Amino acid sequence: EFDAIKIALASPDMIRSWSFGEVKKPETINYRTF
């Protein structure tokens, strides 16, 4: 599937491209309803 590995910095556009959204609230899981 490949024959090499490239590595470098990630432009903010690149990072925002990876993401599928933006996390905004810190709390993870409600305990009264998992």
Residue numbers at the binding site for other proteins (CB under 8 A): 13-14, 16-18, 20-22, 24
Q: For other proteins, which is the closer residue by CB, 6 or 32? A: 6
Shortest separation between residue 24's beta carbon and other proteins, angstroms: 7
DSSP 1-34: --S--------HHHHHHH-SS---------SS--
Cβ proximity to other proteins, 22 vs 27, nearer residue = 22
Residue type, 8: A
Minimum distance of other proteins from residue 17's CB (angstroms): 5
Write the single-letter amino acid at 14: M
